Every structure is written in structure tokens, then in C-alpha cells.
Amino acid sequence: FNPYTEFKEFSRKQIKDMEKMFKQYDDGFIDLMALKLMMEKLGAPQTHLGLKNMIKEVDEDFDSKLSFREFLLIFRKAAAGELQEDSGLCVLARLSEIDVSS
Ligand SMILES: [Ca+2]
């Protein structure tokens, strides 16, 4: 898993910023309770099911937790125009330090 060749739409700086965010809200996985805390600190808490739905959207290996690759997939979906307006994932991407739409 080389995120640098898989996610060519993000600069190395963007990917490293995404990694800094990932490591912070962290074994290398962000589970539901970790995602809950992250949305709380960001100022936008989500419901239990809202968090589960955020994970489900990018959980490509179906273990109900987010690897770094799947975290990057959130930003890929955001930058591809695939997230629903004001969805939990849209809100995470917006409130992160990371601008992907320009
Ligand atoms: Ca997963």
C-alpha cells in the first residue's frame, strides 16, 4: 500500500497532513469510538448511527474501523464530488485542515 501512487490527486503535503490528522485521533486504526472523539473535538458531534454510516461509506475491508488508506478515501470522495452535502463525511473533510476542492 503506497498512498503516494494510489492517491495521485493529493500532494505529498496533503497526504502527510491527512496522516497527521489520522495519527492524532487514533495500531493504525480509527474505530467508532475514536471517530466519535474526533468529531467531538472538531466541534461537530455525530450520532452513533451517523458515525457508523461515515465508516461504512469508506470501510473497504469491512472491519468496521478506518485504516489510513480508508481515511484517505474520505478525502478522495470529497475531491471527486461524491459526498452528500452536509453529511458526516462532508463535515469531517471541511473541518479538517485540508482543502481538497481547489
Ligand atoms: Ca476498515
Residue numbers in the entry: 80 to 105, 109 to 184
Copy text verbatim from the article accompanying this structure deposition.
We failed to determine the structure of the apo form of EFhd2 owing to structural instability during protein purification; however, we could determine the crystal structures of CDEFhd2 mutants defective for one Ca2+-binding site (E116A for EF1, CDEFhd2EF1; E152A for EF2, CDEFhd2EF2). The overall structures of these two mutants in the presence of Ca2+ are similar to that of Ca2+-bound CDEFhd2 (CDEFhd2EF1, root mean square deviation (RMSD) = 0.34 Å for 102 Cα atoms; CDEFhd2EF2, RMSD = 0.61 Å for 105 Cα atoms), which implies a single Ca2+-loaded EF-hand is sufficient to maintain a stable fold. Although the crystal structures of EF-hand mutants (CDEFhd2EF1 and CDEFhd2EF2) are similar to Ca2+-bound CDEFhd2, we observed structural flexibility in the Ca2+-binding loop of EF1 and the C-terminal linker. Furthermore, comparison of the crystallographic B-factors between Ca2+-bound and EF-hand mutant structures showed that the largest changes in B-factor values were for CDEFhd2EF1 (35.6 Å2), CDEFhd2 (20.4 Å2) and CDEFhd2EF2 (21.5 Å2). To evaluate the effect of Ca2+ on structural dynamics of EFhd2 at the atomic level, we performed ensemble refinement for CDEFhd2, CDEFhd2EF1 and CDEFhd2EF2 using Phenix.ensemble refinement. As expected, Ca2+-bound CDEFhd2 displayed a rigid conformation and CDEFhd2EF1 showed the largest degrees of mobility, indicating that Ca2+ depletion of EF1 has a larger impact on conformational dynamics. In addition, CDEFhd2EF2 also showed a moderate degree of mobility. Interestingly, the C-terminal linker (residues, 176–184) followed by the LM-helix also showed significant RMSF increases in CDEFhd2EF1 and CDEFhd2EF2. Consistent with a previous study showing that thermostability of EFhd2 was restored by Ca2+ at a high temperature, the half aggregation temperature for both EF-hand mutants that bind only one Ca2+ is significantly lower (CDEFhd2EF1: 62.32 ± 0.14 °C, CDEFhd2EF2: 57.90 ± 0.60 °C) than the two Ca2+-bound EFhd2 (CDEFhd2: 84.89 ± 0.01 °C) and is consistent with ref. Even depletion of one Ca2+ site in a two Ca2+-binding protein showed a dramatic reduction in F-actin bundling activity to a level that is similar to that of previously reported data for a two Ca2+-depleted state26.
EFhd2/Swiprosin-1 (EFhd2) is a cytoskeletal Ca2+-binding protein identified in human immune, brain and mast cells. EFhd2 and EFhd1 consist of a disordered N-terminal region followed by two EF-hands and a coiled-coil domain at the C-terminus. We also reported previously that the EF-hands of EFhd2 are involved directly in F-actin bundling in a Ca2+-dependent manner and the coiled-coil domain is essential to the F-actin bundling activity by homodimerisation. Based on the experimental results, we propose that the F-actin bundling activity of EFhd2 depends on structural rigidity conferred by binding of two Ca2+ ions to the EF-hand domains.
